Amino acid sequence: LSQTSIPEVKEDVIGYALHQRRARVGQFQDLGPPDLITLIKSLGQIGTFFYCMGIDTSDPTSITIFAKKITDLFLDTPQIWFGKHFHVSKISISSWNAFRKYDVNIIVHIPGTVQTYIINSDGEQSQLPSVAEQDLNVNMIWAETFMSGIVRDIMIMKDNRADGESQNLVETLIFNPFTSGELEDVANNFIKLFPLVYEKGVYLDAPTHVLNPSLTNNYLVETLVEIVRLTKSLEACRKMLKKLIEIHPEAVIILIRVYFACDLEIDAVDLINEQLNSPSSFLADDSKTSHIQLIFKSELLSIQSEFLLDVKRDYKLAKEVAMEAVNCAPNEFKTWYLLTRIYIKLNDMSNALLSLNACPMSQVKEKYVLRRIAPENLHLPLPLDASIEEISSLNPMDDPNLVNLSASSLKSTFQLAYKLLTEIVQITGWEQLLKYRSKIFVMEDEMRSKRLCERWLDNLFMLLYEDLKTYTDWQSEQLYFDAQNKLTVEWELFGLCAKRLGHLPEAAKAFQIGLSQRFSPVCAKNLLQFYIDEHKRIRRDSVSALTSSQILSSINDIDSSIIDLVVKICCWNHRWYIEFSIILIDALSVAVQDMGITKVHNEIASRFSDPVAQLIDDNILNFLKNFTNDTF
Amino acid sequence: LSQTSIPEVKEDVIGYALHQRRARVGQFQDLGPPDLITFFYCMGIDTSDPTSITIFAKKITDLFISISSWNAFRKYDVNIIVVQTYIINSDGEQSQLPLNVNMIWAETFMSGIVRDIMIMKDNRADGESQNLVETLIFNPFTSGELEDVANNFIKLFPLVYEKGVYLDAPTHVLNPSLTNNYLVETLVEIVRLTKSLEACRKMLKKLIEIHPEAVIILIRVYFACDLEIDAVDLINEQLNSPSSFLADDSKTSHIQLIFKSELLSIQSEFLLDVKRDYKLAKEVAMEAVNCAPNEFKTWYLLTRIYIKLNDMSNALLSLNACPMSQVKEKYVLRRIAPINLHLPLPLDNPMDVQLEQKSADPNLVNLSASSLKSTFQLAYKLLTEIVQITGWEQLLKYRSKIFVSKRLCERWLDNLFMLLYEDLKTYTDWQSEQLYFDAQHKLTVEWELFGLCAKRLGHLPEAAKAFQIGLSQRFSPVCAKNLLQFYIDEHKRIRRDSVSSELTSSQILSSINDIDSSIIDLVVKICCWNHRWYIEFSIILIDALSVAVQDMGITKVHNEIASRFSDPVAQLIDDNILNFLKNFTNDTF
Amino acid sequence: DPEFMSSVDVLLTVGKLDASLALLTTQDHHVIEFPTVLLPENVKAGSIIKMQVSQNLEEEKKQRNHFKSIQAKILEKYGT
Amino acid sequence: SSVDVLLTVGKLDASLALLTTQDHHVIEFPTVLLPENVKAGSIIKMQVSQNLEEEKKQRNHFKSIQAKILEKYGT
């Protein structure tokens, strides 16, 4: 905490950030901008600002508390400022409501004036009272702003899972939302406030792979189920949702997605069965419009087939279901995706291509990314709080064949489909794939049953070609050495190529080599992910019915590397102002699931210093210890 | 013609412009930006030779510099400073300049001319309205040094043909072709205005051997030169003879079928616009629709044919089935550097320091049928044309029969319906009070709006009246333009009905002369208003004044203006409009 | 009828539906936008329909003979 | 309830055909569901009938599937 892990951008003229953000209110059109903190401090004097994430917006008193902490740290100790006593004259905090597109800004002065005011889509500076000075729609301002904020906190992590939660906006400081509440449990706050904003949730649009957003498909519901999964707050969510059922019957979907996250498969399956096979079902009544019932039916069947595919796998039943799912929603991505994967797991290479070609692709829609509300002078502090090796900071200046790879830049549905293309090319081989392709697709011009390739699939084929080319080139050039007698960037890149193409241990060990040579966040991330993959693989194969002792030892060692990687990555995040990661919590969760939490903390106490043990205790372990309820 | 008519924008840093050009090259589509000059833009410079451009700069500097032109056949940017001649790519990295220089000049030239014509062609329905203040505009037909410009365009044509589809098409053309595109439109337009036939006939017949599908262009060029019989025989040759390019050894379905579609479209539009005969026209238009059901023009035609047929039962369904353009926009001039300006005054009459800023009836100005764009406007026209024959309640009787075995109205059409409700409402609410008041006033802007509403609904002289009213209390470019259009319409009506009686020879002569004089008087005013706003170029004005010339001797026409107007004004109208017809029309009289 | 030997019989499933369009799915994974007003009366949704696509060679020569006569008529009237 | 539609064939490629009614409907069709000598400017006749027995079949099939799913997982 304290004076480091708080980036600062200076401004030549004061009030710059607030002015720019006030000019930008029109074009936002998003989940939102990140919250903006603007500072005027003193012993002229200077103006600063930075972006923040994870604050408690549910009550302005809490925001005053936060700002009071921010001010307090400066007061306790002088500023470094690369070589000064400072104290905040004026502290501004600007957060965004996306249910209703307006921005609320709270200003705290040293004089002690606490102003709260509102800017909307025109830039019309509406004022903001305090509880009739009706009343409930002032509480709901803070409430909606809070839910909007939490959505912006979770979903930015949940949308960037595939790139390891990369953040290209450096001047942001991120907290853990789950631990941010004074006097209120943020997760429980979200649970309580959910039915109030449930209707308005769709207005928030959806992830890119959701082509047709719904009441039960959107950022709000995803934020909900992610929170419930991470916290295991089963009883409260069950309570409120059961309340919400009587009014809104279609939210039985959200109960099911929660039963799954809290791992009651049985009652969730009973539930789906009741929704799809009862005269009492809300799908059955003739009054409600058929297509809006069809969307929800499609979602239900998609949930069922995804359950039957990703776990407890019956490929046949999942197929017979996913076909109905496609029939109920031919224009959705997920249905075709599931059908394609099931086709793959059944060796239907020809069928998959027809279905993969039939997969609708997201146009114009982008995943949520933190953006900058202004277009060299900066302040990037260097935390001495918790530090390990490789903090030594360099200039990694620069195989152009390896960085001009196109599939690295691949986006969204095209990426998720590219993975399936690798999934089949790892079975058929390249040329057999070419033959299969040639037997159903339209080939080269300059007869009938052949249909048209969708030409994003053609590009995927070209990218697959270049990928295989570079991969085999590397593997050859390495196998030629054979210990007769390598660059970290290139280890990352090649590791990513092998990661894409379906070659796991080669990629993993490439990253391992890169981790011997240097430190790379990407290497440690993908390596950790590889360890989790091996963990799940081993533990499920045992479930299937490696010798029990081989199982035990492999589990222990895998956990013992998972801890180390988690620690190093967490320190990497602390170096760059990020206190939050769902990936790391998920990772440590299974170590704590195997061996006691006590024991995990002991194992980190062994290999690491106390600053680091303390940091990890803050940013992961405390949440797992007390901020979930008695699952462990 | 010096200093006057030349605007500029203050330069906040010297060289703010070309940088903001260089960056924004990365987002240039269609015909692209106007030839920027450092700051003020320009049109109609003759770009076919750098010597000629150096002449342009020589005159420009002699009276009193970085000029930046563009071609979109290949998206690069020719900058010349006075001789630093160079290039900016789409990438935006620079270049240097030295037959592939001649073709650079050729391409930039032809692209330039395409821009200069099509800016004045696609913007006809709003009266060549000019959004950018800063743009100076030359008549492009006038800038020739050692080269008769139109003749150059014709001679330079087939080198840059076949690259035409890169220039795309007018917004009502959904599926561009080697036939349908901005380049061919520019060509046939130039040939029509210059009546420069026997050159184009030679060049096109030369081009036909290598590319046989340009016989469609030869047909359009004929029709423009008032030679239907040659065109009709040619059409029959294309659509029936075994030797034609449509019957071929190697037959593409689609690429030949769009040409068959275009030919049948030309045939049906000819059958309809002239010659009446809606039966054969419909019989062709159905086939044309079948050839290109994804095209707007075919359905547009078929719908129009149904109207004349007098059954609206089909028009409504064939209006619903009409595809709309949801992406492409009409061509306007867009500014490179958005942002205290410079406004010189020519005039060697009308000028108000404050414009508008006067209240207006909230249910008048908020009518959304105004500003309607592209295909939607052209459909709404057919809608008003229908409700003219049916009436609102009979229209609804037809509508509620087939809409909601019926089918869903496509929405845009319902939006058009509500718009028609609003426009009719406004028309009635105007003309009731007007009638009440006219036993025993209103702002000029209100007269503009009402006249536009009535013109939308199809009440022509009831709008011409209002424009004539608004043209009393003020000057208004819109009123003068629409009134002039009304006079052209009446001229056409009377002359057409003179050949097919009702009126008499004497009445015909008198009405024709009055209409002619009114046409001239309306021309000079608008031409002046365009000169005060830097514009020397108008297609419509040339058309109108040309009509007077056909009716009466050009010398006689000049005399009328010389009399009723001043001498430098007569010199002006001689220049911007009449020097043309006198010389550049190839002795057509 | 020669047309019968070249006839094409398909089964389609009636999917998501509008007042305007039904989306139909085959087992070979074609998805078709189809006018709802051309579907039969009880057709609902989640229903199965048979499409029997046949040719017509009489109406082709009919339309050919119509087209030629129309064009010849136009040539007769205007131009020569 | 056999619906007889008469359609005319428009722009035609190896994937898609554009069909046109006299009622002014335009349909986007796949070419493989059309006879082999279809060309362009040809007249086709689409004959549409509902199928009840197939509906019953896939109904019972789907019920059996869902019942099986319930049996193997849950209860």
Swiss-Prot record, chain A:
Location(s) in or outside the cell: Golgi apparatus, trans-Golgi network membrane
Stretch list, region CHS5-binding: 621-632
Molecular function in Gene Ontology: small GTPase binding
Ranges in a coiled coil: none
One Gene Ontology cellular component: membrane
Record-linked Pfam families: ChAPs
One of the GO BP terms on file: Golgi to plasma membrane transport
Keyword Protein transport set for record: yes
Gene3D superfamilies (UniProt xref): Tetratricopeptide repeat domain (1.25.40.10)
InterPro entries for this protein: ChAPs, TPR-like_helical_dom_sf
Keywords in alphabetical order: Golgi apparatus, Membrane, Protein transport, Transport
Chain segments annotated as transmembrane: none
Membrane topology reported for the UniProt record: Peripheral membrane protein
Described function: Member of the CHS5-ARF1P-binding proteins (CHAPS) which mediates export of specific cargo proteins, including chitin synthase CHS3.
UniProt miscellaneous comment: Present with 3460 molecules/cell in log phase SD medium.
Oligomer and partners: Component of the CHS5/6 complex composed of the 4 CHAPS proteins BCH1, BCH2, BUD7, and CHS6 as well as at least CHS5 and GTP-bound ARF1. The complex interacts with the cargo protein CHS3.
Family classification: Belongs to the CHAPS family.
Official protein name in the record: Protein BCH1
Source species: Saccharomyces cerevisiae (strain ATCC 204508 / S288c)
From Swiss-Prot, chain B:
Gene field: BCH1
Membrane topology designation: Peripheral membrane protein
Family assignment from sequence similarity: Belongs to the CHAPS family.
Miscellaneous field: Present with 3460 molecules/cell in log phase SD medium.
Gene3D superfamilies listed in its UniProt record: Tetratricopeptide repeat domain
GO biological processes: chitin biosynthetic process; Golgi to plasma membrane transport; protein transport
Species: Saccharomyces cerevisiae (strain ATCC 204508 / S288c)
Protein name as catalogued: Protein BCH1
Subunit architecture: Component of the CHS5/6 complex composed of the 4 CHAPS proteins BCH1, BCH2, BUD7, and CHS6 as well as at least CHS5 and GTP-bound ARF1. The complex interacts with the cargo protein CHS3.
Keyword annotations of the record: Golgi apparatus, Membrane, Protein transport, Transport
Keyword Phosphoprotein on entry: no
Top-rank lineage group of the source organism: Eukaryota
Function recorded in the entry: Member of the CHS5-ARF1P-binding proteins (CHAPS) which mediates export of specific cargo proteins, including chitin synthase CHS3.
Region (CHS5-binding): 578-589
UniProtKB/Swiss-Prot annotation, chain C:
Disruption phenotype: Abolishes CHS3 localization to the bud neck and plasma membrane, with increased protein localization to intracellular vesicles.
Record-given protein name: Chitin biosynthesis protein CHS5
Task of the protein: Component of the CHS5/6 complex which mediates export of specific cargo proteins, including chitin synthase CHS3. Also involved in targeting FUS1 to sites of polarized growth.
Organism the protein comes from: Saccharomyces cerevisiae (strain ATCC 204508 / S288c) (Baker's yeast)
Protein's gene: CHS5
Residues included from the entire protein: 1 to 76 of 671
Extra facts: Present with 172 molecules/cell in log phase SD medium.
Protein family: Belongs to the CHS5 family.
Subunit structure: Component of the CHS5/6 complex composed of the 4 CHAPS proteins BCH1, BCH2, BUD7, and CHS6 as well as at least CHS5 and GTP-bound ARF1. The complex interacts with the cargo protein CHS3.
Subcellular location: Golgi apparatus, trans-Golgi network membrane
